[PDB]
Each structure stands twice: as C-alpha cells, then as structure tokens.
Amino acid sequence: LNISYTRNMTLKDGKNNVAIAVTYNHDGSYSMQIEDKTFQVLGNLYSEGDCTYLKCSVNGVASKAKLIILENTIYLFSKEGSIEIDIPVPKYLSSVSSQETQGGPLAPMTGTIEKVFVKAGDKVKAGDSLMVMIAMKMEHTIKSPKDGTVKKVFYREGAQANRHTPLVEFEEE
Amino acid sequence: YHGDSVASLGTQPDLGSALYQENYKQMKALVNQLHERVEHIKLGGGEKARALHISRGKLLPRERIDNLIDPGSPFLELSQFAGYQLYDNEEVPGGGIITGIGRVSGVECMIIANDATVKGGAYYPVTVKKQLRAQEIAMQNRLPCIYLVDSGGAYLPRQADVFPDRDHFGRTFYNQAIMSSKNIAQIAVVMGSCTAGGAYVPAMADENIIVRKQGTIFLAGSAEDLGGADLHCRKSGVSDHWALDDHHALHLTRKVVRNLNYQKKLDVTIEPSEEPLFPADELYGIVGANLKRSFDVREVIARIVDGSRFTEFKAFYGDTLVTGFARIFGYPVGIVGNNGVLFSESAKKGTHFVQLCCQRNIPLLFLQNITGFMVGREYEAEGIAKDGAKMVAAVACAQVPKITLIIGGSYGAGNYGMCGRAYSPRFLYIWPNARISVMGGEQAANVLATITKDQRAREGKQFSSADEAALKEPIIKKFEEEGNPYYSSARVWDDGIIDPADTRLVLGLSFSAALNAPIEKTDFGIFRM
Amino acid sequence: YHGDSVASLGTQPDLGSALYQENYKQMKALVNQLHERVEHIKLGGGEKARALHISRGKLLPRERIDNLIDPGSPFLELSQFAGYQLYDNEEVPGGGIITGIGRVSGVECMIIANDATVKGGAYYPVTVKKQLRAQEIAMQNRLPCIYLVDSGGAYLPRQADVFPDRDHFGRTFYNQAIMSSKNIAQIAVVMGSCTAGGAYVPAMADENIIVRKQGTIFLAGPPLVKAATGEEVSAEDLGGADLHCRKSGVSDHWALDDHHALHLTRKVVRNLNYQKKLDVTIEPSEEPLFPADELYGIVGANLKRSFDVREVIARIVDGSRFTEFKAFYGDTLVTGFARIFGYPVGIVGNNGVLFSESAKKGTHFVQLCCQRNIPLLFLQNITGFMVGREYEAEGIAKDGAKMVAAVACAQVPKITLIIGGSYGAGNYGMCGRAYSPRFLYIWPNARISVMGGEQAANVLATITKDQRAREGKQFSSADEAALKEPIIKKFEEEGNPYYSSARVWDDGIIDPADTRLVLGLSFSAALNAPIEKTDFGIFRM
Amino acid sequence: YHGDSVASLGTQPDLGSALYQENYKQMKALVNQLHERVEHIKLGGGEKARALHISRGKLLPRERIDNLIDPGSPFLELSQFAGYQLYDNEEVPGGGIITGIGRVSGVECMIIANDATVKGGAYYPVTVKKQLRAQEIAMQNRLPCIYLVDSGGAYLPRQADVFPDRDHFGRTFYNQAIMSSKNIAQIAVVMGSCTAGGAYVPAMADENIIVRKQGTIFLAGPPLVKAATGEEVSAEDLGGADLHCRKSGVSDHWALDDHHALHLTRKVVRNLNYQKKLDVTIEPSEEPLFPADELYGIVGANLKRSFDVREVIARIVDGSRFTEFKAFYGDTLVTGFARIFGYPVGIVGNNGVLFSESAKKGTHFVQLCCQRNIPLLFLQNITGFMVGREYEAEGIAKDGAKMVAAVACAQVPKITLIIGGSYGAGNYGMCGRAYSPRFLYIWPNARISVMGGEQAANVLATITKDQRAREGKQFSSADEAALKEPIIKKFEEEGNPYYSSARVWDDGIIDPADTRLVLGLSFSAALNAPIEKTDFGIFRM
C-alpha cells in the first residue's frame, strides 16, 4: 500500500556473490539493480514437451532458454550457451557441526588393491601415498589427507575395495 | 445455470470536460502527497538509528516482515499514519509499531512488529492503541497473531496514558489470553530486548522463539546473563525454540505456523472473479476533492465490483441511498452507499436491505459520503428520528462481516447509521479527500452565528458583520484541521488512508481475511415500527 | 449438618498503642475529607442553577432517583468523583451525570440520569465515559437500564473527544441496541429537553416515557431547522410535542409531571416478567466479630508500613470465619474461602512482595473457584521500593504470567478493592481495571501508577548518574534532587485516588467502614446474571 | 506454500562396528523366533482337526477372512499370541479366535472369527478377553463388527472365569447392544454350530446371515431338550434350521455355503450408507530416508545399553522430517511433530530417566496436541537399575503426576509402542494399557513389570541383609543369591513379551521392520471416529 516492494536476493556465480535488488512493479514487470546498473525484466514460463522454458526480455532484449532448478543450482540452457547459478544455502539448513577430521580417502572406484605403503601404526604427511588401486585398467594412487599417524588399515594387497569405502583409519587428535 | 446476460453499471466519463480535468488534477495531488509521506514514514527512526540497528546484526523491522511472509504475497499494512504529528515535538513514524495482515505458510496471519529504530521501541500511547486495534482485528477474524518483539518498555513521561486503564497496556496480555483460549494461535518471536511488561509477551504466547544473543527477557531489568536465549531456552524454559539469527528465527516461525493444523473453510458461495469494466484511475476525475460538488455513487461501484455487475434493490424508493448485490473477487457483497441527504424513505430502505443480507449471510460494504439528515418540521412530525434509529439499530446487530469506506463527508448521526467506527466494522478505510466531525465546519459556524447574533440582538448591544467572522473564522479552521484525514488517521480512528485506485484490491484482501471466521446468526432487537 | 464449631480470624488491636492512635487519626482525616467533598458534589451546578431548575417545575436529579427507587432501599452510586478537577477552569460535579444501582419494584436496575444543573446537561468527554461504564456494568450483570434523560447535547469545544471514536458518544446507542437484543430492558424517561442526537435515546428504548410540557425530542433543534429551511418553530412544537406522543408515536407513555413519570416507570419495571434466580448456595448472614472502624487504626495512611491483610478480612466476612488455602506456602499471598451476606466468596489478598510460590498458589486457587463457580474478591496492596522490590525477577516473570492468564480467563464474577499500592505488573495479576472485574473500588489511602514514585526517582538517579559518570562531566548530589523532586511530585499527584477516580479508572472511593456494605451490594447485583463455565488457555508449566 | 526446505533426522550407522554387528545378530534371532512361532499358530488345532473341518464342507477360519476382505488388501491381525502357554497342558493357538481389522467393500471393519479347529471352538477365559478387546477397539474407532460364528460354547472346567463377572462372556452381548445403539453396524454370519448362549450373537446382530446345512442356532441344545423334556431332536431341526431362516425368522439372509455367505456379507457392508471423513489435514506420503531393517543393529536386544530414540523416529516418519519441541529442556524426553503416511502425529519417546523437567515438558506438549487435535504416539523405553534410578524422587513424584493426568484426559487418538523396558510409574506416564491407548504394540525385545528384575533383587538384598544384621544372626553372601536368583528368574519370565502377549496386555508383538506399516494401518483405522474436544482436570501447579 502506497509503496513498492523491493526484494534483496543473493546469487552465487562461481565464487562471487551477486546482490540483486528486485522491485515488483504494478504492471507485473521487475526492475533489477545489480551494482550500478538497472535492468527492466519481464517474462513467463511455458512448457514444450517435458521441458520448462523461460521466455524473458531484459532491457527490451528478448530471448528463450530452458530452465532447470535442481538442488541449489539454476541451469539456463540457451543456444548462446549454458550458465549455472548457485542459490546460497542458509547456514541453519546446512548440517550444524559439519563432518570434521575426515580420514579415509575413498576408492575412486571398485578395483583391486595393488600396493599398500602403510603399516598398522605409521606416521604420514599430507601427500604420502597410502595405497595403489587398479580399476578397469586405470591406476589410482591414494594419498594421505592429513599429517596424523595411521590408526588402522581396512584392506590388504589383492583385496577388491568397493567405491567410497574407507581405506585407512587415522588416530583422533 | 449461470449463462444469463445481464446489464452492467457505469458510464464513460467526459475526459475532455473541464470538471473532469480539474477533479483529476486535485485528486492526483492528494494521492502524490499521500505517497511521499508514506515514503518518509517507511524510513522509521532515521539513518543513524537504522545504521545502529544493522550494526548489531539485526534485520530492519520491515525486512523482517518481507522474509516472514510467503514469497511475493501482498501485505496489507494497517494504520500507517498512527502518530503522525500527534505529539508536539516528537516524531513517531507509524507509532513505533508495524501491523498488517500477510500470508505465512499459506495462512493469513496478523503480524505485530515493534520498530526498534523509533525511540528505541518505546511504547507511546498511540503505540498501545495501534497494537490493541490489531489484536481486535485478529480476534474478530480468527487470525493467528505473530509478535516480532523488539521493545524498550513504556514511555515514562506519558505513563498515565499507557498503564492504568482498561484499554491501556494491560489489555494487551488480556487479549493474548483470550485468543489462546479460543484456539487462535499466539506466536512470539523475541528478536530483541523485552523488559517489564514486555517479558510477559513471550511468556503468554502458545509457542515462543528467541534469537541467540539479541533477545533478552526479564521481569526486572549483564542483560544476556539476566535474560538471553540460553538462560530461557535451557534453564528457565521460557523459550520453546532457539534461533541463531533473525533469518533463522523467521524460518522457524514459518515452520511453527505450518504445524497449526488449520485449513480455511468458506461459508459463502463463490463465483469466478472478473475485473471491473472501467479503469479505476477514472475515480480521480469523477470524485475530485471538492465535497460540495456531488457525484453518482454508482460510478464508484461500477469501478470496483466484478464485471461492473450490480443488482439494485428498491432503486426508485429513497433514491438518496443506493443498495444492491454485487461480487468482489468472487465474494458476494451487499453495498450501501450515500447518494444525497438521508430521508425517512432512505432509512427504511436501508433497514430492509440489512435484514436481507443478514438472513442470507452476505457481507456488507458501506460507502459513506454523507451531508446530514433531512431537516424540516414535517419530517420530524413523521418520525425521521424514529426512522433513522431503525437503521442504527439494524446495523449494530448485524453479525455479517462489515467493511466501511469513507469516500466523502462523515458528519453527525449519519456516521452512526452508515456503520461508523463505533459500530465495530471489521475494517474502516478513508479516501484522502474525506472529512469527519460531529458536524460540517460551516454548520457549526452558521449555528454559532445564530447564537451570538441572537446573544447581542436580544441583549441589545448591536453585533456587526465584522464581529461575525471574528466568530466564524476560528471555528471553520478548527473543524477543517480536526476533520482532515491525517488528523483522523494519526489517531487510530480508521485502519488507513488508501489511494482510490487501490480500493478494489484493499477490499478484496480485507473481505478475504474476514472470511476466516464462520458467520454467525444475527439476533435483532425490537424494531420500533 | 452445619453445627460444627470452627475457628475465627481477627485479633483485638492495641487501642492504646501510639501506632494505632496515629493511624486512626490520619485515616479519619482522609475519610472526613472524602465526605465533605462529596457534599459539595451533591449540590451539582449550584444554587442559581438549582433555583432555575426548580422554577420550571422539574425535580432535582437526585430527588428523581429518590422517588424512583423503592422506599428506604439503599442506592449504590458509582463514580461520584468523575470530572473532579479534570478540566482546567470548568467545574463539572460528578461529570454531569448520576449513575448507580437501586431497586425498582423489587428489581435491581441501573439508573442513568443527566444532571441538567451542570452545564445545562451537556456531554463532556468524561460524561460519555461514565455513561459507557454504567452500560458495561448493566450488560455484564443483566441489569435493566433506566435513562432519566435531561441533556443539552455534546460539548462542542471538545467534540473530537466525544463524537468520533469507538468508545465515544456513538457507542451509547450501540450498547442500547445490544442489550435490547439480549432481553435486558431499556427504559427511557424524557424529563427535559432531548437535544440533537439525544432524540435517539428515547427512540432506541424498548419502552419510553415523556413528560407533557417539559419533554422535547427532536433530531434537529429549532435553530438547525431555522438555519437549514429558514423556519421558526417552538421547541414543544418541533419535538417532545403531543406530536411526539401521538402524531409521531415516538412516546409510549404520556406523563403530566416528574412525579407522574416516575410512578409510570415503576409500573413499567413491574411488567418485565423477571424473577431473580441464584446459581450459588446460600447460608444465613452474620455480622463480623470485630468493629469495622478499627480498620482506621490498623491500616492508617502510610503505605511504607505493613499490616496483616487477615485483619481486614476478619472485619468484613460473615462471622469472621475464613478457611485459608495453602497458608504456609507463598505466605506473601493470602487465599481462602469465606461468605459475605451469605454469598460464597474466594478472597485473594496481598501480604507482601509477590514471589514464584505466591503466583503458583494464586493460580491454583483461581482454578478451584472457577471449577465450583465461586465469586472472587481481590484485595490489592502491592509493595514498592523495598529491598524485596530490588530482587531478581526472572523467576517472577516466568511464574507471574500464569496468574495473569488464569485471572483473565476466569468467568466467575470478580470484584477488586485497592486497599494500598497498585504498581506495575502486580496490578494485572490482581485483576486490575484492564481485566474486567465487575466492580473496582479504592480506599482513600490508595496509590496507583506504573511504578512507585520512589522507584522511578531512583531509577532515573541511576541513568543520569551514569549519564555524567560515563560521559565524564561530574553530576553532583544537588543535581540529583533537581532530577528526583519533579518525578516524585508527578507520581504522587497522578497516583492520588482522586486523580484516578476523577477519570473513570475505578467505580468510586469508599470509606473503609463501608467496605462490607459496598461488597454486599455489589455481589448481590453481580448475581443477577448466570455464571458461565470457564475456559482456560494453555498453562505454561 | 509448502516449498520450504527443512532438515531431516537420522544418521548412517556404522555397519562395520562390532556393536552394530552384535545387535543386528541378536535382534534378527528374536525376529526369526517370532516368525516361526506364528507359523505354528497359523495351523490352529492341527492336521487332524483341519482335515475334519474341511471334510464337512466348511472353509478354514483364515481362508474365510481372506475371502471376506477386499482382494489384496492388508489385514491387521491382533493378539496372535493370546493363550500362548497360558494353560498348563492345553494348547490354544491364538486363543481359539482370530481378530483383526480389514477392508470389506472399501470400509474398515473389525472381523471376529471363531477357530473351530481349536478345541471345537470352545470359549476359554482368554478367548473372552480377546473378543472383548476387539469389541473395545471397534467401538472406540466406530468400526463395523463382523462375527464369523462357529463356536462350541463355554469351557465348563473353567466356567468361573468365563460366565459371572462384568468382563466375562456376558459383556459380549452388552457391547453388541451398545454399538448397535450408536449406529456401529453389527453383522453376524453363522457358519457353523451356535451353541447354548451363542444363539444370542446372531439374534443381537443388526443383520444376520446363516449357512443352509452347517449353521445351527439354538438356546438349548438337543441334549438339554432331551434332558429337560425327554425329547430327541437333530441339531438342524432344533436350530439353524430352515425353521430359523423362515419359520423362526431369526435369519435375515440364507446362504448355500461358506463362499456364498462371505459374498452376502460383502453386499451387506456395501449397503451401510457410510463414507469415511477425515478431521485432520493431509499431506502427500513419503518414505523414510533410512532403511527400517537398520533398527536391528541400532536397538539390539540388550536393554542395559542405550540408544538415541531419534534414530528410531528417523526410520518411521515421512521423509525422516521431525520438528523437535523443547529440544534442550528435559533432554531425557523427546517430543516433536511429524507425519506418518500423511497423517499428523505428535511423538513422545523416552531417551533416559524421567526428570521433573521431562515431565513438565511432556505435559506442555500433550496440551498442544490436544488443542490442535493431533494424534499422539508414545515410544516407551523406561530405564531401570541405574545410579540415576537410585535418585531422590520427591520432585519426580510431584511433577510426574502432571503427565499421568494430562495423558489420561487427552481425547486425541493415542497409540503406544514399547520398544524397551516398561517399569513402575513410568509406564503410566507413557500411556500404558491402563490409560486406554487405541492400540498398544511391543517389540520382541521389550520387558514390562512393576520394577526391573534387578531392582527387586537388590531391594530384597537390603531388606533381609537388614533382617539378619539388625536381628543379629549373620546373613552371608551365598545366602544373598539364595534370595536374588529366584527373584530375577521370576521377573525375567513374567516380563517376557510372550508372557505379556499371551495374556491380552498388548495387541501384538511386531517386527521392528514392520513398525511403520503397523502404525500407518492403526492410525488410519483410528481416524474413522471424529476427534472430540479434550477436557482436563486441575493441573496441580
């Protein structure tokens, strides 16, 4: 009533946070200000087959693109190109007490263990090779994530290790 | 079968006519004046206060509401002009409190947020009245109440007008207790300091949320140790939910409302909505700002009802009053509007119409543009007072939702018959050109010009024409100043001053909110035949 | 079987003690001051106005009430001090209106009579508030309303405080319409001129009586007809005419004079087909075992000294019999069951600073009374500026609300009597004006405000001592009383009983010796309405 | 708007951990033991009895239910273990009666079928209790009752425990009459002999179906007629005759065989003119985010070890979404809102020893659910013999009662699931059998008794150590286990889930992997009745 609603939105392009001030106009259009530049934006959503399409006009320039919003990423597909924009995730929703002191680099894939370079108790530094695994004839060398001493080893040479299974246990510090 | 073709109201105004050009220009200036004043009120305490508020990590009060309500949903703010020039040297934008109706998790709720940037959130006498009005609206319509609490306590220099009386600060907790007993959810969000009576608000709420460090609760006033989220959340137990920051608390509030297990049910029949057949901005030219000129109220109706369709009741009887059935955004409505001086026939026609709407449970809308009652020896002999009372008595007892819109003058007993503030309409709005007082400014001047002309003619000292305006000019100035819409709205006599182009939208939002409560059966008193 | 012997409250005070002598002397002076001020208010406008009123053949407003009520019946007048020094240079004795409860034809009714000798019966802002309070009392207790209408219209210089708002003059007609719809009889007697906008009062009434020559009812006065249509009409011809009685039909009964109209009113009430029914058990009445005037010595006028509220109870309840509930728990609050004039009552009275235990004890007691449909009486004496007032209140806030919430939802009749201080949130917990007690009375020694005068002074003496200690310019002790003395004066003036009663915050200032009688009359009137079931909100455990 | 993203409960357990491996192995063995025992109960009387039953052209009792309910619909059987080892030398699989809830013609109904292969369908004391429990469930949820009657009368050797008392066989007809008066349809199908006193069941029903050759209904059997009047009559001639169908009129429908009778029953239910209406809000269903079988490893069979009840919740609620209420206050109790198959539910589960804060937190939560008409689910895991169990309980007693009193008065549907121990007053506060939960289920690892076995042993080890220390004859450590070992054995035997379920204390022992399905079916059935307003007693603050 008697004023215009302006919404402060934040979007992440790569590592850069972009602040967008969106004003809801009476006619149904939107006035967006990014930094010192203002844009007049109007558009709508229409469906072709199973794909949702965004028809928009920015400062009088009209374009069409395929819109997909999965998880926190906005995918825009246009014949000019494809752009991904990340929606910031509120801290509260992000698991508080996020996982910490992760020890085991996980097998890149299901493959035979060809070499083990670490004993049950061994002091290792970041970048110290722990194990070598061959998967579909492709050699991967597992490397030490931390400088912590090794608490235990979950696999021995010749064992087949499934994808994303812990390979080494590191002593709690 | 709803395929019948029907007639529609409204006519195309003469845009070239000088009267239309003048009326549009005058009304436009009033609307522009209204808009820019709200812009200033939007800023609250000011840049220094706002900068200090943000420096503490807290959101601005209006940003809190924006994040609380559903994305893109309209927000119906109430009494934006409370406290406007009310106090001699103190500026209190919006009364220090922001109240309105918005949608949270798909549910219409009443939101009451203290503006900490205005006098540190202290409660002025108008602040209490504005909050009490909001609570009254929530109870009458069964709207859940959300309190964004950030307050500094009562304003001691004016304590006598805040603490003691029935409609003083104490009534706020009484309303919370009553609504809770009726299953009208009371949710409090402590986003700041609350002291003395303020601490009772979170305690009296059904569910309560407090921010980690900003929020503080204590009967007697470090603040964090005495109060604080941790103490109440973990030790005192006063806190039901613990929030990291303002954004987290608002997210929690939306979750709380979603668990109310409430679903809206409509008692009225619904039909598809249709836009009016005429532009709303034409109301500027049609109405203007000169109350002495008269316009056809049907023109106003034609530009707010669905499809400009209107079924007039008793069109040729008591023509100074217009009554009929229409629909706004699909809801059925019975409209009563003034089209001249009230007569005995007009009052009888209104009384008959109000009974019809109450019988069918149809909401009522009143359009007040009054100029008084018919004055004459014959009319009194025929019981005009008896007829006028018939309408005051029917309007009072009606239990259907009632909304009043003052589009012109509102004087004397005509105000009561047209559902004034004293008759508990669910909402009351006024246009920027309205005037309200016990009587018109001129009538009070002329009446006094009879009493003292008599005073000196009968006494015998002559009283000249120049002595007349030393009598009349101060009276006219007083009534003009006290009848101004801003004077009426600064105090909470109405729920806001609205742009005429926004009339249809405001009515649609208001009626939608009023339908959250079931419509009760109407019991009338004795009709003095 | 009711033959059991029981213990009784009260002890004999030491009449020889200096404290008792001083307390009696101070309280007596206050009562004498109260009496003589009422005597002046009794005279209304004055000798010249009264002589003019009688010269027109009309009865004086208080003589009308005397003739209306049953012979010898007591009359409970309300808000005698409304408008006392309220307006700077205008004296408005009693607000220009007399309201009270009396018995007409054996039925308790609310009587609202305009005092035509005061400003010609014009409606001042306080006049509207006093009338609205009377209507609220009548509706809550289902008391028929009798309007002795003799008014001169609204006071134009203060129109903004009379006309527009919800609790302004318009609400008067709204209340009449609502009560009529509930079968609460509305009777109007036009015993004098009814001005513009007052003509509605006769019309909105269920039954109406108008005096032959004196009464005039017109929506537009002869002057407005003269201004609007250029027509000159006598007041009798325009309204209150034989035209109103016969041609217009607004009048239901026609009366020769004031005496005849009052006789007709008594007949109208007798035809209401109403009979009072009691929802509560009744026991024979008994006088208290101690004289009431001893309350002067016991209580005194010094709020800093403390007294045992049980002494006050012992001198107002039947036989001084009292069953205390949770006597040893939360001892700062006293709760128990008693009887006044045979009616059962649950009494809640302050005996010190409120604690968490006291609030819990009160909340438990209020639930008991609501369950059994027992009327509640509150005796407010809140304590201020004590070392106890200077205490951690975090627990007090958590537990007090429970009492504010129980008291608000209680549906049993509630009567509040302020026998001492009434400060802060303690007022709310003890059923303040905001919590709709059926009646609220105050003793002449009471004080009410947001906080005690001293606390406001001391609090400010911390804020500005800090202001200049933290800022660095020193702020001396003499600078302290240039801060404290104006504050203490303001709170003393605005907390005075007359200040509170001049505005309608209470229903009257009563002599302590009259406490038992006033309570008996009030509870008797409140029992005219059936007691409803109480629905509570969520108790925050 | 329901598009908000929210947090979800649950964590991935360490499958490699030794504790998880051991817990899974132990719980799996219990589930396998439960499954194979039910398989044996499934066979009823045995091969010889089953062969004889089929030789008469009658369907087996469980085949009758399969044909009665809608094709492919789930069937919720109740009290499968009633009578398990209850009687010393007599095996009574399932108590001789099969009861459960299934869908007939799209309507949820309670089905009560006698198992004629078990002791010829005679009524043992447990048989009466099982039937009475089924009728209680049907009445509380307004479920139509279908009686597949094939019975041999009361078991005379135990008549004193069947006939006389209020909860004895007579109550069965009382329940039928009461449900009929409430418009809860009572349908009886006589598919076999109806003995003396069972002839009432067809008669007391609203609509009745009898099989042509097999069915016989007679108040007095051919032997009693022969003894009383010296008359010899065939069973078909005396009752269940074409005489009963036509001449006597006791039969409303005539059926050729068992298949025909079941077809007729479905038609009868379709004509009830009933449509289910929901009082609660509904949201789309979602599966939990974690596998249910992980509950084996998480919970195990060792009651001394403790687990986080939130893990159990995360694996049964829609989407593993849970809004916790008062998370950090009284942390030994977990309360919050969730949804199961779209229905809203308030969950109360134990997470340790009950404290004063926990009881207060529970009491507050129960009021919230009752106000909003939200069904309540209780997860009982009470803790016993801990240093915490050895604590001052004076506060616990004062505050616990508040929860016992709120839980009792709650009128929302209540379902209780015992996932661990259930001892002492903790059982009452968590909606035990005595507090009329709509359903009560137990996991195969549960234990229930007045107190934990160890506590009773230790308590006695204090009383007699005292007995001989105070008396003066020494009482040695070996004398201690001649005291403790018999007590521990008794409590272990009587607290076993099968002991509790053999008698009807619960409605069945359920596999943890089936917890979500059983709760979904139970809550769906409980919603057939409208939710009433809750009236509370006095909350002792």
Ligand SMILES: O=CCCCC[C@@H]1SC[C@@H]2NC(=O)N[C@@H]21
């Ligand atoms: O074994 C799978 C195919 C690719 C690896 C085979 C190696 S390539 C070197 C050597 N020479 C052969 O012909 N085979 C093995």
Ligand SMILES: O=CCCCC[C@@H]1SC[C@@H]2NC(=O)N[C@@H]21
């Ligand atoms: O405005 C000045 C006094 C004469 C005109 C006022 C008119 S008369 C008809 C109508 N009714 C009133 O009470 N006032 C206006």
Ligand SMILES: O=CCCCC[C@@H]1SC[C@@H]2NC(=O)N[C@@H]21
């Ligand atoms: O008492 C011994 C058996 C035969 C006599 C019993 C009589 S027959 C009439 C009455 N009805 C019964 O069921 N028993 C008795």
